Amino acid sequence: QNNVPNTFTDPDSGITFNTWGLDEDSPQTQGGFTFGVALPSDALTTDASEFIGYLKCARNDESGWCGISLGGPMTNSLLITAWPHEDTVYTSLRFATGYAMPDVYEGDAEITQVSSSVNSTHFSLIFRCKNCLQWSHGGSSGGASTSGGVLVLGWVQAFDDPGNPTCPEQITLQQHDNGMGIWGAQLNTDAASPSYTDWAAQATKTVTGDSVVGVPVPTGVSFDYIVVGGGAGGIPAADKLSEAGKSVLLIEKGFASTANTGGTLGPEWLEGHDLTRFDVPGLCNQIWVDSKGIACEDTDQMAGCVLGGGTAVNAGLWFKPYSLDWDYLFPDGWKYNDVQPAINRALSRIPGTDAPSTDGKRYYQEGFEVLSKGLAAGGWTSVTANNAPDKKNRTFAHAPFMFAGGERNGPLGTYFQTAKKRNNFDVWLNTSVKRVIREGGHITGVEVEPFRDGGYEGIVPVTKVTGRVILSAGTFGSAKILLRSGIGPEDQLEVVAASEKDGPTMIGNSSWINLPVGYNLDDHLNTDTVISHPDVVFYDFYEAWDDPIESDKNSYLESRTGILAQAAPNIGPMFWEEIVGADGIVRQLQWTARVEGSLGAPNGHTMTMSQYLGRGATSRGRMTITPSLTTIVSDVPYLKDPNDKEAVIQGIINLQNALQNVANLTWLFPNSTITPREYVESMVVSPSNRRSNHWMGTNKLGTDDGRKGGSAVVDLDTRVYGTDNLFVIDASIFPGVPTTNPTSYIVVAAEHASSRILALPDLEPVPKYGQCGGREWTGSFVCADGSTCEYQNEWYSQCL
Ligand SMILES: Cc1cc2nc3c(=O)[nH]c(=O)nc-3n(C[C@H](O)[C@H](O)[C@H](O)COP(=O)(O)OP(=O)(O)OC[C@H]3O[C@@H](n4cnc5c(N)ncnc54)[C@H](O)[C@@H]3O)c2cc1C
Ligand code: HEM
Ligand SMILES: *[C@@H]1O[C@H](CO)[C@@H](O)[C@H](O)[C@H]1NC(C)=O
Ligand SMILES: *[C@@H]1O[C@H](CO)[C@@H](O)[C@H](O)[C@H]1NC(C)=O
Ligand SMILES: *[C@@H]1O[C@H](CO)[C@@H](O)[C@H](O)[C@H]1NC(C)=O
Ligand SMILES: *[C@@H]1O[C@H](CO)[C@@H](O)[C@H](O)[C@H]1NC(C)=O
Ligand SMILES: *[C@H]1O[C@H](CO)[C@@H](O)[C@H](O)[C@@H]1O
Ligand SMILES: *[C@H]1O[C@H](CO)[C@@H](O)[C@H](O)[C@@H]1O
Ligand SMILES: *[C@H]1O[C@H](CO)[C@@H](O)[C@H](O)[C@@H]1O
Ligand SMILES: *[C@H]1O[C@H](CO)[C@@H](O)[C@H](O)[C@@H]1O
Ligand SMILES: *[C@H]1O[C@H](CO)[C@@H](O)[C@H](O)[C@@H]1O
């Protein structure tokens, strides 16, 4: 939709609105969308509580529905839902913690109606929302301030119609397949009217209507290592541990993904050759249109919960690490010279490929040829991505992948395969870990509950004394486990205490460790741009799911070759440049070109280039947790430091200087009339639109003790401060986001950290009368036999 509002007068009720919305034939939503607001008189100065609004929604083949997010993200915001049934339009206010079925809003809000109009192609509405702007649901409290002059809103539309469209509260829905978006909505002189109460009392309508399998833990079972989660860092770590001969258990909350992991689920034409939906690179883009049973429901962001984690559902981009990243982002011992052997071990398993097709050819390069030769004339040098990892400035290349055999490979096809064939390695799927149970600073076992049927219920102990637990659960995952284990900031630990789920069963206050868990939240800032060229050829990977092209289908199913052997959409040239700020700090930009429509530009002749803001970004956010025990982003990391925004703008400036030599090339986003500065600042800054989906830094690696008021969570051994046997290997430990897409960096970190943990001497229990604990205490937290750990004060604990 349109940013600058539009004054619109509805004749019958005589009510005035400020209307934003899209149109019928715009390549965003089918049937168009329009929304508006009627506020109180004082709204533009002091915040309004209730309001009045106008909904014009699409109806496709006499079927559909639409929704409004008042906060504008789907998660943790008050949602308005409307669908036609016969003449009557129905409304149910909902609330959604993660990406999933929103539950009925339990707050004080109420909907009343003025007018109802339903025809074949459309159903409109004029209603009144009371106590809607300020909302509270189950401990979560949101709000919308009309005082600022702008209102961030969000919208959806759909084709199918809900489960029975009679009772608003009990309806069932599926993912909205027509359109979605977030836009800042500005208000003006016509938003606030003195007649508001005559219009408010004019709404006379109140619309009416009419467990999991618990399989227990085996008897005498214990493990030298328990690795939680099968993600990017988990599978490589558990593999190297099992290689050493240690008895290792890998606990994954999801199910089998790729066909070599025992996978089943996949499209219709993949039946019989052992290919799943995850294995085919051309079908990788379907995770956006289908999240069912895959995406994590406990996070407000998007993360794959299946086996392999993000590596299963991602594009598969795999890069050889820039040496400057490890030097800049990490302390001594994690630097480049230190992680050099880790890089060699990781790339020997998964060497990069810039030609994913098994015949060593690239397909539909028409889009690539336009930008490549254009950037070459722009003064940018062409390189092979993994043959020159250390040239990131003014340069481009083909997209390297973790693929091989023409299929999605990753840690699933290398690290996991060698792991599954050993004796000492074991995997528990459909099983989520609630917490780690611990006495003082020593973890005994982990507490599991089934996420699905065939899951495990109980407590599985580590080998006595020596046993170690590794948290691979991920950026949001590992932080949630630590918080329910009594480890983290005070405010968040008290949230877990007041929760219904973990409330009565939580550990004692005296055992709480205070670490900045959830802080140092970072990510690549994403800024999309769109160009249009006559020579660019679009390929549809979405219709390839149900009905693949005859040629290309047989090409992949036989020789594992063709356009379906490539990621979706077709990923064009990747170029980087390093920008020096006024603060002296070098910030890294990475552009990713692909052939698709993005911002509402048509698909065929257009290419989208996404700009990631990498290493050098000083801005940080924070991850918190709800009493529902769901992970949300309380503070958005992007664009805090003003010097970060300057780097983004300059990147667009220099890119336009390089690509302006190209004939017939057209810039859709931004248009020719908008300067790159005006285009960046007029954009909305939110986790939804601006995320690159790469999340790192919730548990920070550093030498500065977090208990002493430092920023670190885990030390240089990736071990949690205040604990001898607990370790964390995943993207969460990265102090900042690297130059490039993080997956390859995380697997390397897994290789490096696993080597350190193995090298560590076995834990030796503290003898009687010794000091087993303290808030400054480094050493062994476990007491010798015949002795227990007694808490005196925060600074001291003794073996007795
Ligand atoms: C769609 C998508 C596109 C992306 N594109 C790329 C790309 O092309 N290339 C690239 O470099 N990066 C890409 N990434 C980013 C990358 O996938 C992640 O940053 C990376 O996987 C992080 O790894 P992790 O181990 O820290 O977390 P994850 O990979 O998510 O691993 C966490 C695992 O733990 C499991 N789990 C979580 N909680 C629990 C629990 N409590 N108990 C038991 N198990 C649990 C989950 O099932 C999951 O399998 C993309 C990400 C997404 C989602
Ligand atoms: C059960 C039905 C629903 C499912 C399965 C669902 C799932 C999702 C998923 C997976 C995304 C992100 C997709 C992506 O990142 O590409 C999303 C985004 C969105 N959803 Fe929900 N949703 C549902 C119902 C709704 C409802 C009822 C509303 C509000 C009335 C809503 C508003 C939004 C908006 C505005 C976005 C885009 C902004 C954002 O990503 O947060 N959705 N939905
Ligand atoms: C996990 O659940 C899936 C479906 O929910 C099932 O197909 C699979 O067999 C289960 N795995 C185990 C180990 O129970
Ligand atoms: C126990 O709770 C209090 C506040 O209720 C908090 O100040 C204290 O730090 C907690 N104990 C520990 C060991 O953190
Ligand atoms: C990258 O190259 C450009 C062009 O030569 C130069 O202006 C810029 O300073 C370089 N960046 C760094 C970090 O050296
Ligand atoms: C300039 O941008 C506006 C709004 O984004 C758009 O309506 C207009 O079409 C653009 N200009 C051109 C020439 O397309
Ligand atoms: C709304 O209605 C009032 C009367 O209550 C008018 O005075 C105003 O101009 C607007 O039409
Ligand atoms: C509704 O109520 C307000 C409250 O004063 C009036 O100003 C308005 O004219 C209408 O009667
Ligand atoms: C409730 O009453 C109003 C008049 O105040 C009507 O306009 C409306 O259609 C509903 O019957
Ligand atoms: C419809 O029903 C609600 C019930 O709360 C009333 O408040 C409203 O005035 C209308 O009668
Ligand atoms: C626990 O008990 C089982 C039988 O239920 C044994 O097989 C196992 O070795 C352990 O003693």
Author numbering: 1 to 210, 218 to 807
Describing publication, verbatim:
An oxidative system was recently discovered in which extracellular flavocytochromes, that is, cellobiose dehydrogenases (CDHs), cooperate with copper-dependent lytic polysaccharide monooxygenases (LPMOs)8910111213 to catalyse redox-mediated glycosidic bond cleavage in crystalline cellulose, hemicelluloses and starch. CDHs are large flavocytochromes containing a haem b-binding cytochrome domain (CYT) connected by a long, flexible linker to a flavin adenine dinucleotide (FAD)-binding dehydrogenase domain (DH). The DH domain oxidizes cellobiose at the C1 position to cellobiono-1,5-lactone with reduction of FAD. The ensuing step involves inter-domain electron transfer (IET) from the reduced FAD to CYT haem b, presumably by single electron-transfer (ET) events, followed by ET from CYT to external electron acceptors such as LPMOs.
The crystal structure of MtCDH was determined at 3.2 Å and revealed a closed state in which the CYT domain is docked onto the DH domain in an arrangement that would allow efficient IET from FAD to haem b. In the closed IET-competent state, the haem b propionate-A stretches into the active-site pocket in DH, where the propionate carboxyl group forms an anion–quadrupole interaction with the electropositive edge of the Trp295 benzene ring. Propionate-A engages in an ionic interaction with Arg698, which stabilizes the propionate in its ionized state. The haem b propionate-D is folded away, and a hydrogen bond to Tyr99 in CYT prevents it from interacting directly with the DH active site. The closest edge-to-edge distance between haem b and FAD is 9 Å. This distance is well within the 14-Å limit for efficient electron transfer and is nearly identical to the haem-FMN distance of 9.7 Å in flavocytochrome b2, for which rapid IET has been observed. The MtCDH structure indicates that the haem b propionate-A in CYT interacts with four side chains in DH at the CYT-DH interface, that is, Trp295, Ser298, Met309 and Arg698, a region that we refer to as the propionate-docking site on DH. A channel leads from the surface into the active site of the closed MtCDH molecule. The size of this channel is sufficient (∼11 × 12 Å) to permit substrate entry and product exit while MtCDH remains in the closed IET-competent state. The crystal structure of the closed state of MtCDH offers a favourable association mode between the CYT and DH domains to permit efficient IET.
